[PDB]
Design a protein around this nucleic acid. Structure first.
Ligand SMILES: [Mg+2]
Ligand SMILES: [Zn+2]
Lengths: 104, 158, 94, 8, 263, 135, 37, 1111, 85
RNA sequence: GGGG
DNA sequence: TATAATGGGAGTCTGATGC
DNA sequence: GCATCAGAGCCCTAAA
């Protein structure tokens, strides 16, 4: 189908969660020795997708015969690495915070 | 078609017009120290005298060209619209004219020289104030103009 | 200036409609390898190589020239779009 | 208005 | 988070804004489970608000969050969207483009109004994909991949490749642009005439519309790729078809300077 | 200059809503209130009383129906907060909207007037016609 | 530019802004009066 | 050849050392050559004295010393090191609680040293610190714009050394004080100073309504202590107004000679303006337990008398160059030093309150990191520390004398308005009115005038000769602008007989205002016309004939002149071209009298009278910052007798010691077939043939081999899948051999890198299996020549880890640098300019036979279009050509000083003498007047050029005196129908060359987030099609061209990939898909918690992520 | 404190290495080499290990770091994308 | 910071 | 994991619009 | 009235 319109609207917390592939539980980025992303951190492949096309993190499933499988050992989906541009995460606030645009 | 230094032709009328301007100028000075005219009035009359003397020398430059040198390069370029305009040619063969102070008010003393005769360091410096003000004005304007255009585009684009 | 550009603007109600007709026609020619052209061997646009004369490869040049002949029909809602495509691929293979 | 000062 | 050339890491400011947030959220959860007094939980909560605030719009309220030992405000989500450098006015309403080049412009009196001088070396890059196909069709190379390998080293370029390029550009136009593009004639279409040499040759008559001199101006070249784009350029944008000002209706391409002088 | 001035006068302010949902003092495009008022005069209800409004190009540009247009101009957060609250839908009428999406602008070869124009040669037009002129 | 009826589809608003803006550079009220209007 | 010098002005003093603004400033700051006890309290010394002693234990400063540089300058440039000296300080620790004294000399790091010519070497690259103009500290009074009859007194300290103060007098009648944007009634502060109502009434009172308006009873109802506490609450809402805490705040802001510094110049201006004497640089003191006023009451006293109209009170012009001062290299560096020192002091106090209050020496107590960082930060990242302009010697000379009003402690572009950019009347003789940038920076960046020097306080002074009675002495007085305004100063050209003023009326200035005056009234006189203009402007002959706007371009462009291998001095000079070369230090001179012992390409050995044999090595083909070649050539021969200061070697762009920025060419001023159009320039192929406008350029290439987690990068000759033809010019180790021609695509340094887990794909595995060849462990990462570059390899530097003397940044095994040279012949697109602002790009190179030529066969070099002259109003170039014509036949060069120059009669005399040589030769050789010469003369006599009724020789001579000659068109042989201006002009080849600027891209690198092409030629970038370019395409209605720009030619990834595949297959390009940067926008709005939905006509969502982002 | 998190004990070694160099530079009047630090650190330490440790201690740099002082051009703008074909 |  | 230690340090000019 | 906010032209180079 063809795009005729662009709507913009407020996002409920449910929908923000409807977007998210995982909760970012840790400030970690990548491991200082291996340089691979840290589990549950900002770059985690279990959340945002694989770094390499159709290849999971630990490398049990490395090619496209499996597309959509989630590796039992490392937990990463086998798909295009492009998804690290698309998939959103989320942070679950303990107490609510106001969105400054609607305040200031 | 070429340009040599002799192609900027000082009209004979210039020396005369300068003599006319100085006798006129002395009479206006007498009305100041004798108390006939004010400080405001004296300055205003001087500017008026020198503007008209400037115009006079311009017509003389172009009349001398048309009658006695109609194929002169400066004249030809200006008249055809190839390059040059009367005020620029007037600065080459005439006088440079009145210059502006750093504020905006004009000096009473004009630049009597032409680029062919050459200026005096003091004339050159006096003239510099206006050049710089013109350059700063233009620089700050292109931004105002540029911004204006973007507003117009944004309001009419559909 | 494009040859007979004034006459091409004559043929249309809006200059942009000329461009659409030209562009679409040039695409028709490229996809089908020119064998649907309405030009005749002496009307074919030519291109001078080091070898010598060959067919002008530029299809947009072809299309404007074709248009000048009068042999092209332009308008809206003439033929269902898909049916045209099949009849042309039947008449002029790929 | 100043978070340190408020806490102090 | 990318490794640059030297093995060094370069990272976006958003990562630091998130990290502040995550730390404060996690500490808040811990302070709650351990039953901290209200003064402490309150301090943590207001700090959490500020961390969210910096992430979304940094500097909007309160001191801008900075990386340590730099005064540079971190670039938050609001800064990314908005401003001259923002997403809209930088990557959306305008973009950098492929099949484009730039060089110094030089006058080309011998040109017809619809032509420009285009350096052959510029033309080889701008039309490179077209040139590869043509190099296969005649035969300068066995296939497309080998042809590209030949253009990489400048001494591996033989003279038949230049003839191939002449064939490629036949009947096609290129777009010339000179900044600032004040009105639509800041861009015009020209049929390129390949020239030896590093300079773009511009027709004298179009200098006025572009406000071009030869005191060192440069112009940018663009290649309309599709049959549709090429048609638009040749009909609507061609220099020869725009002779009158869209503003006043008066002639734009008209005699000036030497032309006026001689006549 | 007239094209621009026309856009400056694009908007009106409600003096009396009559039998409508509008509020006194609400600002809206002159076009939208005329369309509404002809639905009221055709429904037999008191029309909206409005007054002409003049705004400079900046204010006028920021007030446009298209939020992609307005937010890419200036005041990006403000434009975007009001649009998101309202649930605004951009119909992609103007140029900037389509430029942002990388769409084909609704001008020149993109205008709906010339966009769908077909070309066919007589040698193909007649060929297609004969097979279908029968059962 | 063509000295003839305008073609449907011409983006006239854009041409209007370019036609008014382009001279802005060479304006010595002056450009301030134009912006005021 | 002969050098004929014009002008009658006798200049009593030579130009000062031109780099002294740099050299003297830094020497004064470091005082390295002064024995410590004799150092004055200034620069580094003053900083230490200000920071110490450090109170709680007391750490006291004894003295500092500067070591010798670890490496010489040449070595620093080679190794990417800073040229610097070790700084040590002797410190004594005292225990106030005990008696303990420990003394040690602690190492504070290095301080960068200035070279002899006034520049720096910071990380191997040469840098210049640009002087900064700003408002002098002091006390100023300006009229209040709001109330046309009231005034504001402003107390301004040195930058970052205190707050700005405003004393506005409010509508209610009370005198208000503004500090840090907060206002209160000034009476309260007066009470804190210990003032009583009597003192203010008795001191001031004379002003009926003003003095009584300051008196407020509630404030007096409290002793000086209560008023101090009361004021503090008015300033710090929330800090408990503890009496010691309040004192601390007010003392540090006002009375502390550490947190508040009026200048030394501030002290003088304050003492002078208010007629008081300051005990220090602070607004108040803490003495005998309370505060005692210094400044505030005198400033209040001056304000009220001015508001009234008391004689002796004036407003201050804030743009006057007496009230505007220069912060030179020394001062700028010292400010950063003081900052770094204060940070170290924080560290001292924090370490003196921890780890045992006893077991600490000064060496453990001091961490020098804050000091080293402040200095390294200033030199590397400051805005006043700039990459040296060393295109030619004049470039750097000019760079060092530039004056900026921007930078850390000055304006911004987003924040500077007309008053500052203006040419002030006081700029006369101090700041050049010509040399400033075109564009946004006009008036903010300027240049020191030729005779100007910055005094110790920082005010620019200019020389004048004293005139007593009517006799002009030779005693010269350097004046500030404030002091100059007192006298009546006659112009430098006023007629003199001997030492006497010979005119009854002289042209003079009083406060910048031009005035006609009798010799009895003449107090001083200008030293020279040169003193009004910069060094670049002073290099323009016949400047009095050039419109200033073009002279500006003339000045700036000499900075851009490229050193030419045949470089020559202009045939018409101004007489400054000798001094510029000498002060630049590019040229080499003899120290004492002597005899030349040896002369080489590489060196010159001189045997002096002393008996010592001194060897001067020559800098040969060294690469400057801009890649122009700095190269010195020997000008003497073995055994030549030299005196002190005689030339030994020529530097770049110098010829026998005179500045050579270009070449002298034979020019014809005339249209030529439109190749001359709109400033384009036509040149003769003869110029390339004889190597005119040829210049050497060197480009530097660098590559690192580093340790990776995948294994070491290796610089090797073994590179996978490459033929021996490709590797031919590489040595055993993989480096290109010295003396090879390298062209784009060629390997410079071979390098291999270990393949990622990208460990060749199964598609590649099977392919590799077919050819019997296993896929290699390493991939080819070799350094290659970029498009459009290349030349001859003249040098290679290799630096490994584990070689004596070298250690690289962590992880880097080895670094190879390759220096590649190119001889650049002039070509089409290169830019030429003369000194009058005529500039143009070379549009056509004609073969010599097409060039216009004189009857005697001499072809012209350059054809310049006359249409460039009349609107531009630069006629000096015309006079330059005429005098240049005379010199071509007379074999001479001239020195015509600016404003005291060769005039028309004098040029005519020279021109007549030339005609005899141009013509008399012919009449004697047995040739008469030409037929075509008669035809032109016919047309010329119709033009009123020649007198009708004279012989052809007489008429040609009449034309030659107008600088016009008969010119033959080399194409036809027929004459040009009129006489044409021909002569010798000085023209430079500027640094803007097509070879550097030509760029093109099909596809290339893309950006990480936006996926749009990168920018710039060096990244192989795409052109920016910006908002305004999109508008143009919209106005054309080019919808598909525009859409291509927005998608297939940028960030539509599927589209750009698919379009390329179609073109190489001969298919038409596909319809585009969504631009990736729109997807970025969508995801960025989601990160802001906004739901952005693409919808169809049925209002159902359309997924532009094609299922990838939904669970 | 670090964008790349480092084990607490490793941060202690790095901080130790810093202090040591500061001592070494204060007595020597110049930057110590890797070998001089390796000596000062005692057994187990060679120059190779001092270098590897400093490599590990390097903090990333902002993609938004400005090149020049104008607001235009960022360091991230000069970084090609090596991932996408 | 230079160029148009 | 144990002397005692209890409140921080630091720096232009425009026009439009909501208290 | 007065404060608070968000505006303030385009393309290009080189240096970091
Ligand atoms: Mg130009
Ligand atoms: Zn796995």
């Amino acid at each position: 189908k063809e795009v005729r319109k662009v709507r913009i609207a407020l996002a409920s917390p449910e929908k923000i969660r409807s977007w998210s592939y995982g909760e970012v539980e840790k400030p970690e980025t990548i491991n200082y020795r291996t340089l691979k992303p840290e589990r549950d951190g900002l770059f985690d492949e279990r959340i945002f997708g694989p770094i390499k096309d159709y290849e999971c993190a630990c490398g049990k499933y490395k090619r496209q015969r499996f597309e959509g499988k989630v590796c039992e050992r490392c937990g990463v989906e086998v798909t295009k690495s492009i998804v690290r541009r698309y998939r959103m995460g989320h942070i679950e606030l303990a107490t609510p915070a106001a969105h400054i645009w609607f305040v200031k | 078609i070429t340009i040599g230094i002799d192609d900027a032709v000082i009209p004979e009328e210039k020396k005369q017009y300068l003599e006319e301007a100085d006798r006129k100028l002395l009479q206006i000075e007498q009305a100041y120290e004798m108390g006939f005219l004010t400080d405001r009035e004296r300055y205003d009359q001087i500017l008026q005298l020198w503007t008209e003397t400037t115009e006079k020398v311009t017509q003389a430059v172009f009349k001398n060209f048309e009658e006695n040198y109609p194929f002169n390069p400066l004249y030809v370029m200006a008249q055809s619209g190839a390059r040059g305009n009367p005020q620029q040619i007037r600065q080459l063969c005439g006088l440079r004219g009145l210059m502006q102070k750093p504020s905006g008010e004009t000096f009473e003393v004009p630049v009597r020289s032409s680029f062919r005769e050459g200026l005096t360091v003091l004339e050159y410096f006096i003239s510099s104030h206006g050049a710089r003000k013109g350059g700063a004005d233009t620089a700050l304007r292109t931004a105002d103009s540029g911004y204006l255009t973007r507003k117009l585009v944004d309001v009419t684009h559909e | 200036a494009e040859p007979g550009i004034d006459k091409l603007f004559g043929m249309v109600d809006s200059k942009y409609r000329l461009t659409v007709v030209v562009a679409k026609r040039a695409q028709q020619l490229l996809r089908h390898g020119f064998k649907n052209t309405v030009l005749e061997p002496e009307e074919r646009p030519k291109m001078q190589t080091l070898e010598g004369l060959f067919d002008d490869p530029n299809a947009v040049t072809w299309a404007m020239k074709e248009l000048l002949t009068g042999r092209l029909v332009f308008g809206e809602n003439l033929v269902p779009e898909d049916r045209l495509q099949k009849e042309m691929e039947r008449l002029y293979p790929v | 208005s100043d978070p340190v000062r408020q806490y102090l | 988070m990318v490794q640059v050339d030297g093995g060094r890491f370069a990272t976006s400011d958003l990562n630091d804004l998130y990290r502040r947030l995550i730390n404060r959220n996690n500490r808040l959860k811990k302070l709650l489970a351990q039953g901290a007094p209200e003064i402490i939980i309150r301090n943590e909560k207001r700090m959490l608000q500020e961390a969210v605030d910096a992430l979304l719009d940094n500097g909007r309220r309160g001191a801008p969050v900075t990386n340590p030992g730099s005064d540079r405000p971190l670039r938050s989500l609001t800064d990314i969207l908005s401003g001259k450098q923002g997403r809209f006015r930088q990557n959306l309403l305008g973009k950098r483009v492929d099949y484009s080049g730039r060089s110094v412009i030089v006058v080309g009196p011998q040109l017809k109004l619809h032509q420009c001088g285009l350096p052959k070396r510029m033309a080889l890059e701008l039309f490179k994909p077209f040139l590869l196909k043509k190099m296969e069709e005649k035969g300068i190379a066995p296939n497309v991949k080998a042809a590209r390998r030949m253009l990489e080293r400048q001494r591996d370029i033989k003279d038949e490749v230049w003839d191939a390029l002449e064939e490629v550009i036949h009947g096609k136009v290129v777009l010339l642009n000179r900044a600032p593009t004040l009105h639509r004639l800041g861009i015009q279409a020209f049929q390129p005439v390949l020239v030896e040499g590093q300079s773009i040759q511009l027709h004298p008559l179009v200098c006025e519309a572009f406000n071009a001199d030869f005191d060192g101006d440069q112009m940018a070249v663009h290649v309309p790729l599709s049959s549709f784009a090429q048609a638009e350029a040749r009909i609507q944008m061609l220099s020869a078809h725009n002779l009158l000002s869209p503003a006043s209706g008066e002639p734009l391409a008209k005699p000036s300077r030497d032309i006026i002088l001689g006549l | 200059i007239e094209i621009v001035v026309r856009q400056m006068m694009k908007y009106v302010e409600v003096t009396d809503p009559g039998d409508s949902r509008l509020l006194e003092g609400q600002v809206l495009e002159k076009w939208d209130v005329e369309a509404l008022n002809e639905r009221l005069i055709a429904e037999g209800k008191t029309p909206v009383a409005w007054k002409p409004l003049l705004m400079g190009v900046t204010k006028s540009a920021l007030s446009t129906k298209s939020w992609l247009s307005a937010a890419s101009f200036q005041n990006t957060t403000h434009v975007l907060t009001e649009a998101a609250i309202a649930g605004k839908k951009d119909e992609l009428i103007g140029l900037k909207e389509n430029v942002i999406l990388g769409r084909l602008i609704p001008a020149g070869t993109g205008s709906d007037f010339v966009r769908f124009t077909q070309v066919v040669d007589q040698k193909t037009l007649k060929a297609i016609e004969e097979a279908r002129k029968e059962a | 530019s063509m000295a003839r009826p305008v073609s449907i589809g011409e983006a006239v608003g854009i041409v209007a802004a370019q036609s008014i803006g382009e001279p802005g550079t060479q304006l010595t009220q002056g450009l301030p009066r134009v912006i005021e209007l | 050849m002969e050098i004929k010098r014009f002008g009658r002005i006798r200049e009593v003093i030579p130009l000062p050392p031109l780099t002294e603004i740099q050299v003297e400033s830094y020497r004064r700051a470091l005082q390295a050559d002064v024995p410590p006890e004799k150092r004055e309290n200034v620069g580094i010394q003053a900083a230490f004295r200000e920071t110490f002693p450090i109170e709680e234990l007391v750490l006291d400063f004894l003295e500092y010393r500067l070591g010798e540089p670890p490496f010489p300058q040449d070595e620093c440039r080679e190794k990417d090191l800073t040229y610097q000296a070790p700084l040590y300080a002797r410190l004594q620790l005292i225990h106030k609680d005990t008696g303990l004294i420990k003394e040690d000399e602690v190492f504070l790091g290095h301080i960068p040293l200035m070279t002899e010519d006034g520049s720096f070497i910071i990380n191997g690259a040469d840098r210049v610190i640009v002087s900064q103009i700003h408002r002098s500290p002091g006390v100023y009074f300006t009229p209040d714009p709001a109330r046309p009859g009231r005034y504001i007194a402003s107390i301004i300290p040195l930058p970052k050394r205190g707050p700005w103060i405003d004393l506005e007098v409010e509508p209610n009648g009370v005198v208000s004080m503004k500090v840090n944007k907060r206002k209160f009634p000034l009476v309260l502060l007066l009470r804190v100073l210990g003032y009583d109502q009597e003192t203010l009434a008795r001191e001031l009172g004379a002003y009926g309504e003003l003095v009584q308006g300051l008196m407020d009873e509630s404030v007096f109802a409290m002793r000086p202590e209560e008023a101090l506490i009361r004021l503090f609450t008015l300033l710090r809402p929330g800090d408990p107004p503890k009496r010691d805490k309040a004192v601390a705040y007010v003392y540090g802001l006002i009375a502390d000679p550490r947190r508040y510094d009026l200048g030394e110049a501030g002290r003088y201006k304050a003492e002078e303006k208010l007629g008081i004497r300051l005990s220090g640089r602070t607004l108040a003191r803490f003495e005998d337990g309370e505060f005692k006023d210094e400044v505030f009451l005198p400033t209040l006293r001056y304000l009220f008398a001015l508001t009234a109209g008391v004689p002796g009170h004036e407003v201050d012009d804030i743009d006057h160059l007496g009230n505007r001062r220069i912060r030179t290299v020394g001062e700028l560096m010292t400010d950063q030093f003081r900052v770094g020192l204060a940070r170290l002091a924080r560290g001292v106090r924090e370490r003196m309150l921890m780890g045992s209050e006893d077991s600490l020496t000064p060496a453990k107590l001091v961490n020098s990191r804050p000091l080293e960082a402040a200095i390294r930060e200033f030199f590397s990242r400051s805005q006043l520390s700039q990459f040296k302009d060393e295109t030619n010697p004049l470039s750097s000379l000019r760079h060092k004398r530039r004056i900026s009003a921007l930078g850390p402690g000055g304006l911004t572009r987003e924040r500077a308005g007309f008053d500052v950019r203006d040419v002030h009347r006081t700029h006369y003789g101090r700041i050049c009115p010509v040399e400033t940038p075109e564009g946004a920076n006009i008036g903010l960046i300027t240049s020191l005038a030729a005779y100007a020097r910055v005094d110790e306080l920082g005010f620019i002074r200019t020389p004048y000769r004293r005139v007593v009675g009517g006799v002009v002495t030779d005693e010269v007085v350097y004046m500030t602008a404030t002091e100059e305004d007192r006298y009546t100063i006659a112009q430098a050209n006023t007629p003199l007989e001997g030492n006497r003023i010979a005119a009854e009326r002289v042209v003079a200035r009083r406060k910048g205002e031009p005035v006609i005056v009798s010799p009895e009234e003449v107090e001083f006189m200008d030293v020279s016309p040169k003193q009004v203009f910069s060094v670049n402007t002073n290099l323009i002959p016949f400047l009095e004939h050039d419109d200033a706007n073009r002279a500006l371009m003339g000045s700036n462009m000499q900075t851009q002149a490229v050193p030419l291998i045949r470089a020559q001095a202009p045939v018409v000079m101004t007489g400054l071209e000798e001094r510029v070369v000498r002060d630049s230090l590019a040229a080499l001179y003899a120290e004492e009298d002597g005899e030349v012992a040896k002369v080489d390409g590489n060196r010159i050995v001189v045997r002096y009278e002393d008996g010592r044999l001194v060897e001067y090595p020559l800098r040969r083909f060294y690469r400057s910052n801009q890649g122009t070649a700095l190269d010195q050539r020997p000008r003497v021969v073995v055994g030549q007798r030299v005196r002190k200061g005689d030339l030994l070697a020529d530097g770049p762009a110098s010829e026998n010691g005179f500045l050579a920025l270009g070449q002298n060419v034979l020019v014809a001023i005339m249209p030529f077939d439109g190749y001359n159009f709109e400033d384009a320039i036509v040149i003769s192929e003869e110029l390339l043939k004889r190597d005119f406008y040829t210049s050497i350029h060197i480009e530097r290439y660098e590559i690192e081999a580093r340790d990776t987690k995948l294994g070491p990068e290796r610089i090797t000759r073994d590179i996978p899948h490459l033929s021996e033809a490709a590797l031919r010019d590489l040595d055993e180790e993989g480096v290109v051999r010295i003396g090879a021609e390298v062209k784009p695509g060629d390997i410079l340094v071979g390098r291999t890198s270990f393949k990622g887990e990208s460990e060749p794909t199964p598609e590649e595995r099977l392919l590799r299996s077919i050819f019997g060849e296993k896929a290699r462990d390493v991939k080819d990462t070799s350094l290659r020549v970029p498009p459009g570059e290349g030349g001859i390899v003249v040098r290679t530097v290799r630096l490994r880890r584990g070689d004596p003397g070298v250690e690289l940044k962590p992880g880097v095994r080895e670094v190879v640098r390759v220096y590649v040279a190119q001889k650049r012949k002039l070509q089409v697109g290169d830019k030429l300019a003369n000194r009058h602002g005529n500039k143009g790009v070379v549009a056509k190179i004609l073969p010599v036979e097409d060039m216009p030529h004189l009857p005697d066969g001499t072809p012209v070099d350059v054809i310049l279009n006359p249409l460039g002259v009349p609107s531009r109003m630069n006629l000096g170039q015309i006079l330059e050509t005429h005098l240049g014509l005379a010199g071509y036949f007379l074999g001479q060069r001239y020195i015509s000083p600016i404003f005291d120059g060769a005039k028309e009669p004098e040029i005519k005399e020279l021109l007549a003498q030339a005609f005899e040589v141009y013509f008399g030769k012919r009449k004697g050789e047995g040739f008469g007047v030409d037929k075509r010469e008669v035809e032109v003369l016919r047309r010329a006599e119709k033009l009123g050029l020649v007198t009708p009724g004279k012989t052809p020789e007489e008429q040609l001579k009449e034309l030659f005196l107008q600088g016009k000659v008969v010119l033959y068109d080399g194409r036809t042989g027929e004459p040009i129908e009129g006489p044409i201006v021909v002569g010798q002009m000085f023209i430079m080849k500027l640094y803007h060359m097509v070879e550097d600027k030509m760029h093109a891209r099909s596809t290339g690198p893309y950006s990480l987030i936006t996926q749009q092409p990168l920018g710039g030629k060096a990244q192989f970038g795409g052109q920016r099609f910006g908002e305004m370019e999109v508008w143009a395409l919209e106005a054309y209605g080019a919808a598909h061209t525009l859409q291509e720009m927005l998608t297939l030619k940028s960030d539509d990834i599927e589209g750009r990939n698919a379009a390329y595949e179609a073109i190489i297959k001969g298919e038409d390009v596909p319809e585009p898909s969504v631009p990736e940067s729109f997807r970025v926008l969508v995801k960025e709005l989601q990160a802001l918690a906004l739901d952005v939905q693409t919808l169809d006509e049925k209002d159902n969502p359309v997924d532009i992520f094609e299922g990838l982002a939904s669970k | 404190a670090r964008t790349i998190r480092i084990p607490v004990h490793m941060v202690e070694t790095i901080n130790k290495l810093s202090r040591t160099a500061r001592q070494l530079q204060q007595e020597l009047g110049r930057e110590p080499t890797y070998e001089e630090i390796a000596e000062a650190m005692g057994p187990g330490w060679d120059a190779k290990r001092v270098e590897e440790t400093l490599k590990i201690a390097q903090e990333p740099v902002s993609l938004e770091t400005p090149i020049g002082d104008e607001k235009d051009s960022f360091y991230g703008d000069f970084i090609p994308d090596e991932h996408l074909p």
